Ligand binder design. Sequence first.
Ligand SMILES: CCCCCCCCCCCCCCCCCC(=O)OC[C@H](COP(=O)([O-])OCC(O)COP(=O)([O-])OC[C@@H](COC(=O)CCCCCCCCCCCCCCCCC)OC(=O)CCCCCCCCCCCCCCCCC)OC(=O)CCCCCCCCCCCCCCCCC
Ligand SMILES: CCCCCCCCCCCCCCCCC[C@@H](O)O[C@H](CO[C@H](O)CCCCCCCCCCCCCCC)COP(=O)(O)OCC[N+](C)(C)C
Ligand SMILES: CCCCCCCCCCCCCCCCC[C@@H](O)O[C@H](CO[C@H](O)CCCCCCCCCCCCCCC)COP(=O)(O)OCC[N+](C)(C)C
Ligand SMILES: CCCCCCCC/C=C\CCCCCCCC(=O)O[C@H](COC(=O)CCCCCCC/C=C/CCCCCCCC)COP(=O)(O)OCCN
Lengths: 105, 98, 121, 83, 129, 347, 171, 99, 71
Amino acid sequence: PFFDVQKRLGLDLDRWMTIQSAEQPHKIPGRCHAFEKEWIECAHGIGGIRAEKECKIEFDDFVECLLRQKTMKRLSAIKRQRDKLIKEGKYTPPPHHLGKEDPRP
Amino acid sequence: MPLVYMNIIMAFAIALAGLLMYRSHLMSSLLCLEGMMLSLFIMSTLIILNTHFTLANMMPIILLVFAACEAALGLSLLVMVSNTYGTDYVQNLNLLQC
Amino acid sequence: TMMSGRPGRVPLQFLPNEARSLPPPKLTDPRLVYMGFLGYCSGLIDNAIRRRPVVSAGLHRQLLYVTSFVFFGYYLLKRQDYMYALRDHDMFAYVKSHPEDFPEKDKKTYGEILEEFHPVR
Amino acid sequence: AGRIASFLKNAWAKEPVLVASFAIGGLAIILPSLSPYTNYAIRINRATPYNYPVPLRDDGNMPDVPSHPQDPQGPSLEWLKNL
Amino acid sequence: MTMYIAFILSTIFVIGFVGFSSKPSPIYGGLGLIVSGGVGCGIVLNFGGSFLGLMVFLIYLGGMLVVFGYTTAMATGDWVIYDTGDSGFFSEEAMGIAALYSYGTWLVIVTGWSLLIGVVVIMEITRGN
Amino acid sequence: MNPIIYTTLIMTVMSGTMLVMISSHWLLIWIGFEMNLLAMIPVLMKNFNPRATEAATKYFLTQATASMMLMMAIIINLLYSGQWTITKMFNPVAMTMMTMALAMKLGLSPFHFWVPEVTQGISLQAGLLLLTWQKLAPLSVLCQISQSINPNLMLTMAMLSILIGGWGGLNQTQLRKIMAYSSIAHMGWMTAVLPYNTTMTILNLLIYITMTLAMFMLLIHSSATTTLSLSHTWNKMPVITSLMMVTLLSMGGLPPLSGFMPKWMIIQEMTKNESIIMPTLMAMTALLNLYFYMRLAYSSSLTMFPSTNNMKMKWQFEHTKQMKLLPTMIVLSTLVLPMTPALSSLN
Amino acid sequence: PGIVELPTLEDLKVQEVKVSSSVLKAAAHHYGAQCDKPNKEFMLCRWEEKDPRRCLEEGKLVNQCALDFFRQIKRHCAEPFTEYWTCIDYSGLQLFRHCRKQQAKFDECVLDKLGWVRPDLGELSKVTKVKTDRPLPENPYHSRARPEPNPEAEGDLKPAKHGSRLFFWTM
Amino acid sequence: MNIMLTLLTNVTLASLLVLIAFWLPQLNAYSEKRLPFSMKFFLVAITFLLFDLEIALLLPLPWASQTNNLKTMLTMALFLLILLAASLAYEWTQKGLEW
Amino acid sequence: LFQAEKDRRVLQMLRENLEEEAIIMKDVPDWKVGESVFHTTRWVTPMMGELYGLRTNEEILSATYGFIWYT
Ligand SMILES: CCCCCCCCCCCCCCCCCC(=O)OC[C@H](COP(=O)([O-])OCC(O)COP(=O)([O-])OC[C@@H](COC(=O)CCCCCCCCCCCCCCCCC)OC(=O)CCCCCCCCCCCCCCCCC)OC(=O)CCCCCCCCCCCCCCCCC
Ligand SMILES: CCCCCCCCCCCCCCCCC[C@@H](O)O[C@H](CO[C@H](O)CCCCCCCCCCCCCCC)COP(=O)(O)OCC[N+](C)(C)C
Ligand SMILES: CCCCCCCCCCCCCCCCC[C@@H](O)O[C@H](CO[C@H](O)CCCCCCCCCCCCCCC)COP(=O)(O)OCC[N+](C)(C)C
Ligand SMILES: CCCCCCCC/C=C\CCCCCCCC(=O)O[C@H](COC(=O)CCCCCCC/C=C/CCCCCCCC)COP(=O)(O)OCCN
């Protein structure tokens, strides 16, 4: 099966493209660099099984950064409640959210 | 997972199903394969651009290149099949049976 | 037992250095003799296929077959013994390091154990 | 010696385009390894600041790191001006 | 929010794939695929992938579908998941793509060998005899 | 074709397989699969005829669809986790689509339909290469991602492959279709032990490859592609028929022959995981493969079929081209049972 | 999982710099030459803390330094600076190269008035050191405890007990 | 937006002016009264497709020239162009560019 | 200076959104105002929808597509 020639010879044929946090050109960071860094450091040498049970917090944070399901759900709930109150008529957005604020540099 | 990715995957599934229907015209089979690779390109590009994976910007071009090369091969094959029968109908390839 | 992921394993090493601490198989090992017999059978079938005197067509060819088979068999047996030694070492170390999973059974004599008796009738 | 010259002379006639193309390609392959300005181009690429230079926290043991851009120590670009 | 323009683009893309997935009159299927490729290129360009979108629109549309139609002629929600910062004085897409010559040596080697073998394979297959 | 071109294409096929086997990046694995696909097509069409062209285009269609599904699985995996390394699949049915793509590449049921057709269309050397070398890369990927696979789907497709191979081999008079159905059944046996032990999968792969090489080289030496065409071999080369019958008995899984070693081990392994019913059913179904092997043996060497007059002239000539590795392949596929524990070498 | 803390709207009030990008580009070289220390402290704190909320004071300091720099320009060199930044503003690329003459006028004026020397090519891009008393953050990533590694067994190899022990083989 | 408006304007003007050209002479009343499949033309299209793919590979060259690893990028660009020339030469010597 | 202004503006927008959330969610039973969706206490760069979620459509279009649509 897998013949790990790269590790035996120290060639680095394709390991540079495997993860987001591995020496991007011009030091451009990935959107989830910190989360992936934390998850990788936590799971290094532990192994996949213990890694799957014990590094669940970091992986959940990484997935939340990647897809942001929880953030969009919370924003949608806030917007839905705001729409409900604005249709009922007990809430009025401030001028800041209406375009009448004083923009800052 | 937003709705755009779901729409792209639905498009890919539709292309794959249409490839699996085989009304006629193996040229349509190649067309379905190319629609599938187009959907793959679009969704992979969207995912890579979104997460700012700078080195991953290599991958779509590569994919495109390889897939187009495949298309060339397929087209060649089609011609020879047609070159035997004069038409690219699927049912002409009934010589081999299980 | 999937030992592909064993820590400290050189990827493409057929025989690691630590395998040199194990007794090599003897040159008169029965498995080596069987590999030589396999080479001899290969030579006989080679003679038979090409329509040559099966027993006495090519002595050099049969000798080469037997020698190559013995060589590969010796190295394969070394690797086999090394891998089994690794398995036993790992099992013993795991038993040593996890005492709570392998308790010492209380020795009990048959004179104080009641086993149900089923007559043969 | 003579056979090669004869082949090149026969190719320069009735096939000049191929001779010119092969000569230009061979020169493009060979010349960069001999020019002294390729290192200059590499250095020019090195001196183009695309990112903000993040300052280093001083600990009193970096005599080579300047505290201000006008300090003499640090990489200089007088050679690039001379170019 | 322009009524979620990306949503309409994706729906038109799906509609086009459904349209030629029935495979009617393979030139009409190819034209539906041309429209679908244009819509997908518009999706990628509107997302911000100018270079990759132009690669689609040039390579895919102008070479591959053109050769397809040529051979046939011979025969008979959004805006939320985005970023906050900037990119500098360049585009990250261009830097990542141009890294192919400095970072992706292995990719260049394998792709070039594959393309050369593709040319040889095409010649051998189309030899005939 | 030109021998240089043929050598280059064979080296490209092998280089694609090696690129699949040595790379840790999913894109490089897909590129290796693409390279192998591209270089395989002319090999199937070395002898130009409509049958070979039809087989090549069917193979190309199936493999291109499999590659597209593989890329979709890779992209979904990347979407749900920004990883390119070949590791645990990290996601639901993305793994299902990966398994389906690899099954179509290998020829497992329910994606078995193309194997008999492509094998019948192409010649015997192309069939040898197709049925031996084209299994290394997908099986290597499956062994790498074995801890990810859902056991239900893999075991279902393995049992389906065994059943379909057993039933479809019974109806064949062509030798190439028999070999194709044998390959399907053997792949079914191989993939039913992947969830439990990949070493057993590799051992089965080695034994099957040896037996298939011996069988195809014996079929090439006595150039017959039909049961009756093979029935004429005894009048010229009885020793070839005897070796072929022994090899066929070995492929049937009979002890003490070599082909008994994998199934035995596999059954043993599956009993360690508290699984009994599937090993029982697999053995009872492999009985069908044995039946049609035994029918071929009856028609080959245990009985003497009528011959033809012109056969006499063939008595006066000898094969100009001789296969060097054929004797070794027969011995390895017949007489290696006592060396069974050597499987600890993690072959 | 916790409550995110944000500074009050009062903590984010600062006397803002209300000059356009043309004025900033015209003054940028002398601004980097003169306001280097607060800017470097702010950027060092910003890259070490990895948090906008932990670097709020330094932003006020850099704003104050910019305001002081512009106040000195207004008191001493208002007019030539006005022509210089007007010229810079006309160009669609805001190129320095089209009116080196106005730049020379402004540079000589500031050199005569405030003794300001313009930094040379490649000087503002140097990596400089910052003398700060702010403590180095010990865990900027808020990392948890890394899980314990495997027992990493070690010892001397011995032959397997009773051979392979697979079925009937004695070796 | 601006590009969309420009494309829409161009298409709309072309369509309207084509329609008026096609309908102005339709208001006045008047009388109102194979197989061969050449194989070289397919090879031309296939060769164009392959060379277009290699051009697609060559396209990022203007940005490739600022990487600080100039030797490696120069080697890889020259390698790509050499293989493009090799493809052209192989198709030339195999009588693939004949009529 | 641009970095300082960016940090201040982002924080001020987040503060406004937090105030509006506190006002709006006063009757929702199980809501906790300003609760992080991450287990870590590290600062996380807010999304574009976190800053412009409650604002008007025109400036959402600006912040999302202005650079892409500027020609
Ligand atoms: C359990 C483990 C222990 C035992 C091991 C078992 C296996 C051992 C052998 C393995 C294979 C190696 C040899 C096979 C090569 C084939 C060559 C052959 O055919 O023989 C011809 C040859 C004589 O003929 P010839 O004059 O050369 O020319 C005639 C042509 O060759 C041919 O003339 P022809 O073509 O005109 O005749 C035609 C005939 C000829 O066709 C054949 O005979 C084919 C040969 C059999 C196929 C081999 C398959 C591979 C091996 C599988 C073994 C299976 C074992 C497992 C149990 C399952 C049983 C099937 O074919 C037919 O008649 C067609 C129908 C046949 C009936 C059905 C077929 C069943 C065959 C299965 C046989 C299985 C046992 C084989 C034993 C050895 C047989 C030679 O025989 C020999 O002389 C060689 C025999 C062995 C040599 C012994 C020398 C040692 C003595 C000195 C050393 C002392 C030793 C101790 C040292 C210390 C003492 C001081
Ligand atoms: C069917 C009979 C078997 C014969 C097989 C062909 C025999 C000819 C082969 C010639 C020599 C091959 C040896 C290769 C030289 C070096 C190999 C080394 O570099 O590789 C090591 C591995 O060594 C080889 O794998 C051992 C191959 C030996 C095969 C023999 C076992 C046969 C099964 C028992 C039947 C008895 C046959 C006896 C007659 C030959 C490192 O592997 P690793 O990178 O860490 O992990 C990849 C493998 N994993 C994933 C499964 C763990
Ligand atoms: C050692 C094995 C040799 C024999 C086996 C050959 C196996 C197949 C042939 C392909 C293998 C060739 C090795 C190339 C591997 C790529 C990695 C290595 O070359 O290092 C590169 C060095 O690049 C070299 O210039 C590679 C030049 C060699 C390629 C040119 C010709 C290749 C042809 C090989 C076969 C192709 C088809 C046949 C053509 C005849 C990386 O550059 P580097 O700057 O360190 O790091 C960049 C990352 N940074 C930016 C962070 C610093
Ligand atoms: C590794 C170097 C690559 C870099 C340079 C090359 C880049 C691009 C150039 C190559 C593109 C592909 C060229 C394909 C060559 C095919 C040749 C061929 O087969 O054509 C022969 C003709 O080709 C030849 O003549 C054989 C070789 C001729 C010379 C080729 C160049 C060899 C070296 C010449 C220059 C050496 C260096 C320059 C020094 C010159 C002094 C300044 C037949 O011609 P027809 O068109 O079929 O005529 C039939 C109708 N009458």
